[PDB]
Amino acid sequence: GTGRIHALALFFALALFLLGLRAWQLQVLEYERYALRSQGNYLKTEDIPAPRGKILDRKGRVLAQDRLVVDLVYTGGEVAFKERLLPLLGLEDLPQVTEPTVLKAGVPEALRPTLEELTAGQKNLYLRERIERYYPNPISGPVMGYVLRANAAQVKQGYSPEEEVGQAGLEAALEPYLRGKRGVRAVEVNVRGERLRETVLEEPTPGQDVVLTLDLALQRAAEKALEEALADINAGRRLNGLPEEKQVKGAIVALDPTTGEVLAMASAPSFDPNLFAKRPVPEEAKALLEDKNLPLLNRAVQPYTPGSTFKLATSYALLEEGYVTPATTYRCSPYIVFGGQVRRNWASRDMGPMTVREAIAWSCNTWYYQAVAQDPLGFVDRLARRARLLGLGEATGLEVAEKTGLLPTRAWKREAPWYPGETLSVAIGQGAVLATPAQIARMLATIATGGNKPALHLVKAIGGVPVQPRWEKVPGRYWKVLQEGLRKTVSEGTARFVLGEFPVPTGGKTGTAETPGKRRGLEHAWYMGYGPTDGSPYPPLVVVAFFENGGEGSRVALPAVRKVMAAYWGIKGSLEV
Amino acid sequence: WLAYDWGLVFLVAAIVALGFVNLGSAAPDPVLLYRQSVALGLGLLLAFLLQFLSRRRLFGLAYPLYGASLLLLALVLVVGREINGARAWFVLGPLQFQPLELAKLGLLLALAKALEGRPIARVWDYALPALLTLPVVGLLLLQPDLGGALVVLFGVFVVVFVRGLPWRHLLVGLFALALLVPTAVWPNLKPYQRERVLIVLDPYRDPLGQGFQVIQSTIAIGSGGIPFRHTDFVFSVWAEEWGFVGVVGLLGLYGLLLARLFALALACPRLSDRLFLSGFAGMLGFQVVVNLGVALGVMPVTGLTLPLFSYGGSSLIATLAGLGLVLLVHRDRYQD
């Protein structure tokens, strides 16, 4: 009845002892941390900015960083050592304004020491320092992206307005890792007002440095090759009478099939990430947001009609279900009647007898018309099984925000009401088989590897921890047949004229997608192409190029891959010197 | 009859003495020193007037004061004044009163007279005190007042810790309650509220915790010899000006104060006197260790002043009126 009271008397005794111990800590162990120089000097506390991490690719080429922005501000209009400043600054006069104004922004590293000797520590001439994100090797915005200050809605989440929030596809995924801890310090201020001693109370974390799987070499090649496609897009649209439409819409992805690393990813019309970052309020960036086009969205992750590229998966599902043996016989006629309407072929004359290898090679559509006509109602559901198995329906595992790729099933059309004549258009990719170039680039990487389904990832190393790649295998009984037909397309199919005489034995397939708008001759230019089919001493590579309404995938997309492939394996041009 | 414990009275006087002394630098406004001086006169006269009562009459109004305190905690949310985001006062001009003081002094008596009987330890040990505590805290969280509710919940715990003592069942009950409630509030907590609570645990966020972080630096200024407020941070003003050799003197008096409170609590033979004097010393000590813990950068900010040092229009009177009831039940410990 009394022992419990002794405990509370002991509890409140040790509690006041711990308070006495915590006080002694601050008073005795930390008095050097709170010295006042034997005078009435007050103490101010100021937070320390957080150095955001440095985004750089493999081999150490910096792609993003932040440093100091040194400006010259002066108020009053005093001479000081004016005779030496005018030739150094090149202004030849001091514009006398009432409000504080800036002279020579972005002071270089050589002018700063010379100015500092002439600063003289006077009240008029000082050097304000600012933090701004700097991209030394800027990469396509829709992939790399931009940086803005903390929004009003984000401020309530505990972010200071001096913090930088990245809405970027790449900088948002890395934002939790890149952000450093905003430290806090306290400085002894004299009666005069001078700095005397700094005291660190929260050591700032300088963020983490992410190493990407991108290569700056292949990245310039991708963005470059997007522009010569415009010269070919305008050339193709010229034969149709449609306007030149010089906008360079589309994107391109180039990755490693084995390790699942992405080596080159770009979109267009991309922007410059330094615009949103450094300047306080750039007006040109405001027009980018109100753009009628899509200059910020990455077309590598948005759903588009795949067309003849999806037929490579149609043949896969056709071989795994057991519909056709690798040595079947079908004549690629010019016309085929499903029973309701005539299914048109891309050509106009008889091609001859073909196999699965010959069907993919010459991209025959009448093959997949006859082959699916056996079981048109049950294959479409089984088609999406293998399609989602290859990596077309689900997500790629990219750090950048990605859009949903819609695959059609009988169940989907019921919730959207199904007709049998839709299967043939779905087998090639007309029936709303929406897919993204990122997913499309992965579908080729699985077949090129022959079973492995690697996960795409831009990041190679966050901080110092090497991110390990995650694999997954798919059940494939006949892979070589799909691989031969892909090189048979380069050796004898559509890519005969571009990559036939090419040194590295490449396989792939061209793609054109009848646009749903009007189907007026401007299709979606597609082409996929993986690395050395034969065991030549070259590292593997998969490249996929897409162009909105570019048309003639053989004429627009195929050369774009030839350029990126040439940059990867170092293919020399007319260099006889 | 002059049968009190003057050692307890001297410890009270020695700290209120430094109270006005520390209010020389803190709150130097002479208009403030006047309303504090007249608060001591009314605080000492009320405690002098409370001595003209018997212990039986004191415990005869346990349920009346408890039931009346609930009427005030339910009325303060209608015709009260909002000082800092919560209506918890009655100010009709020259009057200053808080319904939370009568709730503490009323719940201490009510839970001492009631728990004098047998508590059913199996299940209903935490039934009657729970039924008498939730109406109090419930009418405090609707103000809202988190600091005042923690003093209430700690005082009720002390009373149960003296009579009930369900040690095996009590600790396991707290561990479960301390894991299920956060698992329910955190998902339903807003980002405005989630960050708010995270800032309470870790005080390193300047725009709200700069002054409170400055307190930790302000205290450590002087050793061996601008703050946000003079109320919630009397000790920081005092600890900074008086160095460390003083800090032990204040912690000493408060240590000796809570000692004689518990000491006289043992001299009383009746159970309800054990409960009432333990719940009072617990309710008073809990404020000190929390107030000084906030100042020393250990306890999270709760918004509770430090007795015998804080500037209080009714808080000083209520604490002195609380100390008078302690000296009342002590001289009445023998007689019935």
Write the DSSP string, A83-135. HHHHHHHT-SS----SS-EEESSS--TTHHHHHHHHHTT-SS-EEEEEEEEE-
State the Cα–Cα distance between residues A290 and A205, nearest whole angstrom.
37
If you ran DSSP here, which 8-state letter would residue A403 be given? P
Residue A388's identity, in one-letter code, is R
For the four alpha carbons of B7, B11, B12 and B13, in that order, the dihedral sign comes to: positive
Contacts of A35 (CB under 8 A, 6+ apart): A188, A197
From chain A residues 186-245, the ones with a CB under 8 A of any chain B CB are 186, 201-202
State the Cα–Cα distance between residues B155 and B1, nearest whole angstrom.
31
∠ CA A232-A489-A458, rounded to 5°: 70
Ramachandran area for residue A443 (φ above 0: left; ψ -120 to 50: alpha; else beta): alpha
The closest alpha carbon to B218, from B195, B232, B201, B235, belongs to: B235
State the Cα–Cα distance between residues A15 and A20, nearest whole angstrom.
8
Kind and range of the H or E element at A320?
Answer: helix A311-320
- Residue B135 touches partner A, C-beta closer than 8 Å: no
The torsion angle over the Cα atoms of residues B316, B317, B321 and B323, rounded to 10 degrees, is 20
The torsion angle over the Cα atoms of residues A517, A521, A524 and A528, rounded to 10 degrees, is 150
* Candidates 3.30.450.40, 3.40.640.10, 3.40.1370.10, 3.40.710.10; CATH matching A216-569: 3.40.710.10
Q: How far are the Cα atoms of A193, A241, A545 from residue A235, in angstroms, in the given order?
A: 70, 10, 18
Q: Are A424 and A228 in contact (CB under 8 A)?
A: no
Cα of first residue to Cα of last residue in chain B, in angstroms, is 16
State the Cα–Cα distance between residues A143 and A297, nearest whole angstrom.
8
For the four alpha carbons of B148, B154, B160 and B163, in that order, the dihedral sign comes to: negative
The two three-digit tokens of residue A186, written as one number: 């306290």
Q: What are phi and psi of A447, to 5 degrees?
A: -70, -35
- Residue B281 touches partner A, C-beta closer than 8 Å: yes
∠ CA A455-A460-A465, rounded to 5°: 115
- Tell me the HSE value of A456 on the side-chain side, using a 13 A CA sphere: 32
Q: Are A124 and A74 in contact (CB under 8 A)?
A: yes
Hey, are the CB atoms on A8 and B259 less than 8 Å from each other? no
| Rg of chain A (C-alpha set) | 32
State the Cα–Cα distance between residues B179 and A499, nearest whole angstrom.
66
Provide DSSP, A199-225: EEEEPPP---PEEES--HHHHHHHHHH
List chain B residues with CB under 8 Å of A19. 251, 289, 292-293, 296, 298
Q: Which residue in chain B is spatially nearest to A158 when comparing CA positions?
A: B195
The two three-digit tokens of residue A87, written as one number: 């030739």
State the Cα–Cα distance between residues B50 and A543, nearest whole angstrom.
91
Query: What three-state secondary structure class fits A574?
Result: coil
The closest alpha carbon to A51, from A173, A161, A272, A209, belongs to: A209
Kind and range of the H or E element at A32?
Answer: none
Kind and range of the H or E element at A291?
Answer: none
State the Cα–Cα distance between residues B216 and B218, nearest whole angstrom.
6
Q: How far are the Cα atoms of A70, A138, A279, A286 from residue A283, in angstroms, in the given order?
A: 22, 20, 9, 5
State the Cα–Cα distance between residues A471 and A479, nearest whole angstrom.
18
The two three-digit tokens of residue B52, written as one number: 């003209």
Query: What three-state secondary structure class fits A568?
Result: helix
The two three-digit tokens of residue A161, written as one number: 């307005």
List chain B residues with CB under 8 Å of A13. 255, 259
List chain A residues with CB under 8 Å of B281. 8
* CB atoms near residue B72 (< 10 Å): 19
* Closest residue to A9, CB basis, from B244, B259, B293: B259
Q: Are B287 and A14 in contact (CB under 8 A)?
A: no
Crossing angle for the helix pair B146-163 and B99-114, to the nearest 10 degrees? 10
Provide DSSP, A123-191: SS-EEEEEEEEE-SS---HHHH---EEPPHHHHTTT--TTSEE--SHHHHHSHHHHPPP--EEEEEE-S
Cis peptide before A206 (omega within 30 of 0): no
Q: How far are the Cα atoms of A174, A269, A272, A305 from residue A295, in angstroms, in the given order?
A: 22, 5, 10, 20
| Residues counted in chain A | 577
Q: How far are the Cα atoms of A262, A493, A559, A571, A572 from residue A575, in angstroms, in the given order?
A: 29, 29, 19, 10, 7
State the Cα–Cα distance between residues A104 and A98, nearest whole angstrom.
18
Is residue B8 packed enough to be buried (19+ CB in 10 Å), middle (13-18) or exposed (0-12)? Answer: buried
| Residue whose entry in the numeric block shows the structure tokens 């970052």 | A277
Kind and range of the H or E element at A15?
Answer: helix A3-24
For the four alpha carbons of A52, A58, A63 and A66, in that order, the dihedral sign comes to: positive
The alpha carbon of A252 is separated from its chain's Cα centroid by a whole number of angstroms, namely: 11
Q: Are A237 and A245 in contact (CB under 8 A)?
A: yes
Q: Which residues pair with A525 in a beta bridge?
A: A512, A547
Residue B238's identity, in one-letter code, is W
| Residue whose entry in the numeric block shows the structure tokens 């410059």 | A272
* CB atoms near residue B68 (< 10 Å): 15
Contacts of B274 (CB under 8 A, 6+ apart): A1, A5, B162, B265, B266, B268
Interface test with chain A among B198, B247, B257, by most A beta carbons within 10 Å: B247
Dmax (CA) of chain B: 61
| Sheet strand arrangement including A43-47 | A43-47, A184-189, A195-202
Contacts of B220 (CB under 8 A, 6+ apart): A26, A27, A30, A31, A33, A34, B240
Q: Are B32 and B23 in contact (CB under 8 A)?
A: yes
Q: Which residue in chain A is spatially nearest to B285 when comparing CA positions?
A: A12
Interface test with chain B among A6, A14, A17, A26, by most B beta carbons within 10 Å: A26
Q: What are phi and psi of B325, to 5 degrees?
A: -65, -25
The closest alpha carbon to A203, from A182, A176, A177, A186, belongs to: A182
State the Cα–Cα distance between residues A278 and A147, nearest whole angstrom.
9
The two three-digit tokens of residue B319, written as one number: 């604490």
Q: Which residues pair with A66 in a beta bridge?
A: A133
Cis peptide before A505 (omega within 30 of 0): no
Residue A113's identity, in one-letter code, is P
Q: Which residues pair with A44 in a beta bridge?
A: A187
State the Cα–Cα distance between residues A298 and A284, nearest whole angstrom.
20
The two three-digit tokens of residue A191, written as one number: 């009666």
Ramachandran area for residue A73 (φ above 0: left; ψ -120 to 50: alpha; else beta): beta
∠ CA A91-A93-A98, rounded to 5°: 110
| Residue whose entry in the numeric block shows the structure tokens 């293919």 | A571
Hey, are the CB atoms on B248 and A20 less than 8 Å from each other? yes
Q: Are A225 and A248 in contact (CB under 8 A)?
A: no
State the Cα–Cα distance between residues A408 and A422, nearest whole angstrom.
10
Q: For residues B77-99, b (16+ Cβ closer than 10 Å) or e, as one string? A: eeebeeeeebbbbbeeeeebbbb
The two three-digit tokens of residue B44, written as one number: 């000492």
Query: What three-state secondary structure class fits A252?
Result: strand
* Closest residue to A5, CB basis, from B205, B224, B278: B278
Contacts of A363 (CB under 8 A, 6+ apart): A308, A311, A346, A489, A493, A494, A509, A510
* CB atoms near residue B225 (< 10 Å): 9
Q: Are A524 and A545 in contact (CB under 8 A)?
A: no
Cα of first residue to Cα of last residue in chain A, in angstroms, is 104
Q: How far are the Cα atoms of A401, B144, B285 from residue B138, in angstroms, in the given order?
A: 46, 9, 23
- Residue B274 touches partner A, C-beta closer than 8 Å: yes
From chain B residues 162-221, the ones with a CB under 8 A of any chain A CB are 162, 165, 191-192, 195, 198-199, 204-207, 210, 213-214, 216-221
Experimental determination technique: X-ray
| Rg of chain B (C-alpha set) | 20
| Header resolution in angstroms | 3.5
* Closest residue to B289, CB basis, from A2, A19, A24: A19
Q: How far are the Cα atoms of A399, A443, B196, B198 from residue A455, in angstroms, in the given order?
A: 11, 11, 39, 36
The torsion angle over the Cα atoms of residues A324, A325, A331 and A337, rounded to 10 degrees, is -10
Q: How far are the Cα atoms of A117, A163, A368 from residue A52, in angstroms, in the given order?
A: 31, 9, 53
The torsion angle over the Cα atoms of residues A446, A403, A557 and A491, rounded to 10 degrees, is 20
Q: Which residue in chain B is spatially nearest to A41 when comparing CA positions?
A: B221
| Residue whose entry in the numeric block shows the structure tokens 């196999």 | A355
The two three-digit tokens of residue B322, written as one number: 């609380």
Query: What three-state secondary structure class fits A313?
Result: helix
Is residue A37 packed enough to be buried (19+ CB in 10 Å), middle (13-18) or exposed (0-12)? Answer: exposed
The closest alpha carbon to A42, from B235, B213, B214, B207, belongs to: B214
Kind and range of the H or E element at A79?
Answer: none
Query: What three-state secondary structure class fits A379?
Result: helix
State the Cα–Cα distance between residues A362 and A489, nearest whole angstrom.
6
How are the residues of chain A apportioned to helix, strand and coil, as percentages rounded to the nearest 5? 35, 20, 45
Contacts of B253 (CB under 8 A, 6+ apart): B11, B14, B15, B18
The closest alpha carbon to A354, from A370, A339, A343, A338, belongs to: A370
Beta-strand relationship, A459-462 and A465-466: antiparallel
3-state secondary structure chain B: CCCCCHHHHHHHHHHHHHHHHHHHHCCCCHHHHHHHHHHHHHHHHHHHHHCCCCHHHHHHCHHHHHHHHHHHHHHHHHHCCECCCCECCECCCCCCECHHHHHHHHHHHHHHHHCCCCCCCCCHHHCHHHHHHHHHHHHHHCCCCHHHHHHHHHHHHHHHHHHCCCHHHHHHHHHHHHHHHHHHHHHHCCHHHHHHHHHHHCCCCHHHHHHHHHHHHHHCCCCCCCCCCCCCCHHHHHHHHHHHHHHHHHHHHHHHHHHHHHHHHHHCCCHHHHHHHHHHHHHHHHHHHHHHHHHCCCCCCCCCCCCCCCCCCCHHHHHHHHHHHHHHHHHCCCCC
Q: Which residue in chain B is spatially nearest to A13 when comparing CA positions?
A: B255
Query: What three-state secondary structure class fits A258?
Result: coil
| Residue whose entry in the numeric block shows the structure tokens 């005018």 | A86
Q: Are B150 and B287 in contact (CB under 8 A)?
A: no
Q: Are A524 and A304 in contact (CB under 8 A)?
A: yes
